[PDB]
Structure formats: structure tokens, C-alpha cells
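Hey, weird one. I pasted the Active core crystal toxin protein 1D sequence into the form twice and got a warning about non-standard characters only the second time. First submission, copied straight from the form history:
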Amino acid sequence: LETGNTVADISLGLINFLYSNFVPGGGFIVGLLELIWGFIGPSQWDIFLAQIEQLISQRIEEFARNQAISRLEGLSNLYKCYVRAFSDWEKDPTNPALRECMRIQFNDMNSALITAIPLFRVQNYEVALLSVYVQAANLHLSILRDVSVFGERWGYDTATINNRYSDLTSLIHVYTNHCVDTYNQGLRRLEGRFLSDWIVYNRFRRQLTISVLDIVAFFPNYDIRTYPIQTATQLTREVYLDLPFINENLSPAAVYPTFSAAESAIIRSPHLVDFLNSFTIYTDSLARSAYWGGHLVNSFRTGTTTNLIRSPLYGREGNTERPVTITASPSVPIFRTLSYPTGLDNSNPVAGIEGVEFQNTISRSIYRKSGPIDSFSELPPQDASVSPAIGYSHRLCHATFLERISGPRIAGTVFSWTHRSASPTNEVSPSRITQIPWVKAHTLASGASVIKGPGFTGGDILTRNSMGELGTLRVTFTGRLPQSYYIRFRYASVANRSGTFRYSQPPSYGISFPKTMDAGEPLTSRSFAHTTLFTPITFSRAQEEFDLYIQSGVYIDRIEFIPVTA
């Protein structure tokens, strides 16, 4: 019985927790132990390394490799002691002896992490180590936040607490930049000329978006000065499954599409987040082999279910069987596909999909027949202790199509998914600092473009080549009205720039974007900063519509709502 991606399983369980429980205290301290550091043994760390080693065709040098694994086992034992010292100290916090135990454990944990981290980026093996690096970096930022919140009650003096907060602040950027830089270099190494190369490249991007980049996106939340109450990051990136090939050694290379052809056909260029409303699937055939030969997609954007965007036609509109319609909705998403690729018979003349079962949270719909290629394998549910309809991690977003009519015939349907944290409603609650990426807007103003994100924000970003509007973003305030919030923007800027913030009522507000970078340098962790509107706004309608006008040279990542009280 096939196992599925155990690293994806562990990662998405961790992501679920980071989204739902990112708030200081023993619950978070025990959560990391229960989900990672008291759960993963050397057996499983081996798989972490090997999953990347197989993708890049490079085994970590053996001494460095066993050094990493035993170092991770060392951190597990230390973190067990740390959690134990915290549970103890929590019950009798004034006890000077318990306070000394925690100060000892923290000092031990921090030192072990300071020395272990470089062993997770050993020269020439940084990519293969990257998913264990991100786990150690995460643990490090978490205990540095721990001391920033509790260190005084543990008995640390003011200077060392300030020193650790300065460490947290610098290392958010250092760890972020290392993960993104290493990820980009791993991707570059997998660029090649042919479709066979694209398959590996596309798998790498999926597997490391989930096991590394998705965790990096939460790193800024560990800054308690910036996020003094609970906050949740939305992962808005699209992740893609595989082309419907069984044998992925596509030979000879000359008879198959190029790398650029596949990338350009399969990966949607940057856009506002959308959600599946329906597929219309057209069945075609070659002699007696029937397959998914083309389709339309109908999508809606966040908060606005009634304005559907119809895709251009993918593939051909065959008539071998009547068109089939597959539907989803905001609260009835499709969370699982079971695909039957034609290549399950080595003799079929088309590379494509003979059938798919779609499972939604209520019922099922089958295009032609069910198959064994299971979305749960690469995108497992974020909670396995509960039914799949309750515990899924991703919702079916879109489907693209690599078409080759001549040569070996290709009907390359590929499914794309959005993570559960990117809800189809931008909800703002007075008990959270709410983060809303601007790609969750529902209109894109003319002259505004969605551009590819750097890698650490969790999704794509907005900019303009000349001053003007981004587009309207819809919000629903939950709970008893009225509510008052400070507005804050995460942005990057090549110069001192400004903008204007509007909602559907007449008071508008100027926003400033002090320079964060130089024109022409790449976006890196420190290129993004926060800017705050210090006049709070009070809202009294549940549904609200926001606009942002910006000058050029500004990149917008997200808007944030900081409750004035509660």
C-alpha cells in the first residue's frame, strides 16, 4: 500500500497549527513538541532528507548526513526538557527554583540551536538539508519569542531579554532569506530543456512550497511587538499536481514538448485569488480511447460569488460524450481528486485523464470513472484524526492543460489547489490581528498588476507601473458591531512614496511608504516593512469594500486590521 508524502503530512499538520493557534503560551510550546519535535524520530528525518535528495539526484555526504540526523535527535531531547521545565514553571511561576530550571533549559535550547543550524546548511548540501533547516529555524524563532514574552517572569534581566528580542528580529530575516535563496537555487538547478526535466522541477516546487516556504511565511508572526495578540497568515499561493503520466522518463526528448512550453501552458501567470465554481469537461477520443480533451473553468473571487470569471477554452471541445459539469461553492469545496490516467494501460495512444472522481464536503461526482492517482498523496489532509471532509488541507482551485495533438498525443490536464487558510471570505474579527493579502481582492484595477511573490509572503503581490488604484477588496466583519481597528500595510518601496486608502464611506486616509530598497535590487526579507495608519477607523456595517491608490515603485503584500480594544 502506497504511503503518500509523509513530509507533506507532517508539514501541513504543522501549518494548520501555525494558522490556528499562533499565540504565546504553553499551548504553542507543547504544540511544537507534539507535532514535530516529540513526533519525528531518526527514521522519519531520514525521509525528510531523502525526499529532497531524490528530487535533485544528490545524496548528502555521509558524515554530514548522519551528523544532521543525530543533531536533530539531540534537539528533540533538549526540547522535551524545555517543555517539561515550562509545564513545571507554569504551575508555580514565582518559585525561584523552577525559574532557574527554565533559564537553564532555555539557555541549553538556544545554544544547541545556535550550533546545530549551520549543520543544516553544510556547504554544497544546502538544498538537500533545507526542510530540516526550516524546522530548526522555526523552533529557534519560537523559543526566542518565548523568552521575549516570559523571560522577565523567568527571571532574566532587562538587557538579556532585549538582546534575545534583537536576535529574534534579525534571525527572522536571516532564516527567511536562507530558505528562499536556497529554494530558488534548487529550482534553478532543475531547469532543463525538456518535459522530463519540467516534471521534476514542477514536483520540487510543489514539495518545497509545502515543506519549507509555507512555514517561512509565518516567521514574521513571532515578533510580539509587531503582533501583540493572535494573528494568522493566509497562504494564497496556488500549488499544482502532476501531468497525467505514469512513466515520467519521456523519451526521446525531441518528440515531447519543451520545458518552457509546459511551464507556460500549466502555470497560471499571477492573478487575484480565485475559487472553483464549475468545470465543463469535454470528452474527446482517438480511435476507441476516450479522454478528457478540453474544458472550461468558471471561477469566483474572494467575497464575491456572483461575478463569475470564465476561462478561455483549454484543449479541444470534443463530442465523444456529452459535456460533464463539476460544481463547487464557498462552503462545499472539492477537497480530493482520484484520477485514472490513460497511461495506466501502457498501450493507450493519449497521455491524459480517462476519468476523475471529485469529492466535496457533502457528496461525490465522477467524470467517467474513478482512479488511483490521489490528491491526498501530495496534498494530504491537515488533520488525519478526523474525516477527510473536515480535515482536508487544500481546495480544488483550477485546471490547466498542456496540449499536443501531433507527436505522441498529450492531453495534459493538471489540477491546481489553494491552501485552506486562504478563505473565500475575507473575515475580520475583533479578537485577532487579521492579515489579508491584497491578492484576495475581487477586482484588479486597470493599470494594476499581480506579480510573482518573492517566496516568503505566502503568495503573490500587487504593484503599479504608474500611480493609481489596485482594485477593490471585500471584507466581512464578524461579531458584534461596531468595531474599531488600526490599519497596517506590509509593503516594499524603492523610494519614499505614498498612497490613499478608501472604503465605501467618505473619509479617506493618506498612507506613506518609506523607502525599503533600491530600484533594481531583488525583493528579500528586509525589503518588506510595515506602515501604520495611526488614526483608527470605526466600522458599523458587516460588509465593507476597500480601495488602495498607490504611487509607482510600491509593492503591496497585505493589509492588516489591528483591534483598538479586545
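That's the output from the first submission. The warning seems to come from a hidden character in my clipboard, not from the data itself. Residues 238-424 form a domain with the Vitelline Membrane Outer Layer Protein I, subunit A fold (CATH 2.100.10.10).
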